[PDB]
């Protein structure tokens, strides 16, 4: 930067620009049946659960 | 007042199904258990059952 105690820089034109910003909002709504995942259709295993 | 998740369901078992190949013969366990001579432990005999 060409710094000085009496020199300033003033822009003479401008450029309009468009920027893209991506942010997550939601998440996949999962649902797990705990009894089914541990052991399916087993009454003896469900009794131990 | 609200929505509530409950237990998973599946249809109850109605009967038992057994599906085996239609084999009729019996392997001779008589020559294994009622055998006359038994081999030694250093020359143990192996018999295939199928
Ligand atoms: C083997 O010996 C037992 C004991 O007497 C007898 O009951 C059985 O019938 C015998 N089996 C054969 C195939 O001889």
UniProtKB/Swiss-Prot annotation, chain B:
Effect of residue 30 to D: In strain: Omicron/BA.1, Omicron/BA.2, Omicron/BA.2.12.1, Omicron/BA.4, Omicron/BA.5, Omicron/BQ.1.1
Consequence of substituting residue 30 to H: In strain: Omicron/BA.2.75, Omicron/XBB.1.5, Omicron/EG.5.1
First-to-last residue of the parent protein present: 310 to 359 of 1273
Organism ancestry: Viruses, Riboviria, Orthornavirae, Pisuviricota, Pisoniviricetes
Domain of life: Viruses
Residues carrying covalently attached carbohydrate according to the record: 14, 16, 22, 34
UniProt-recorded name of the protein: Spike protein S1
Complexes and interactors: Binds to host ACE2. RBD also interacts with the N-linked glycan on 'Asn-90' of ACE2. Cleavage of S generates a polybasic C-terminal sequence on S1 that binds to host Neuropilin-1 (NRP1) and Neuropilin-2 (NRP2) receptors. Interacts with host integrin alpha-5/beta-1 (ITGA5:ITGB1) and with ACE2 in complex with integrin alpha-5/beta-1 (ITGA5:ITGB1). May interact via cytoplasmic c-terminus with M protein. May interact (via N-terminus) with host bilirubin and biliverdin, thereby preventing antibody binding to the SARS-CoV-2 spike NTD via an allosteric mechanism.
Region (Disordered): 10-26
Known function: Attaches the virion to the cell membrane by interacting with host receptor, initiating the infection. The major receptor is host ACE2. When S2/S2' has been cleaved, binding to the receptor triggers direct fusion at the cell membrane. When S2/S2' has not been cleaved, binding to the receptor results in internalization of the virus by endocytosis using host TFRC and GRM2 and leading to fusion of the virion membrane with the host endosomal membrane. Alternatively, may use NRP1/NRP2 and integrin as entry receptors.
């Amino acid at each position: 930067v060409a710094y000085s105690n009496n020199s300033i820089a003033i822009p003479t034109n401008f450029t309009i620009s468009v920027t893209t910003e991506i942010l997550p909002v939601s998440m996949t709504k999962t649902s797990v049946d705990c009894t089914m995942y541990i052991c399916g259709d087993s009454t003896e295993c469900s009794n131990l659960l | 007042k609200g929505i509530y998740q409950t237990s998973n369901f599946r249809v109850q078992p109605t009967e038992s199904i057994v599906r085996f190949p239609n084999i009729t013969n019996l392997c001779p366990f008589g020559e294994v258990f009622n055998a006359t001579r038994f081999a030694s432990v250093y020359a143990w005999n192996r018999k295939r059952i199928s």
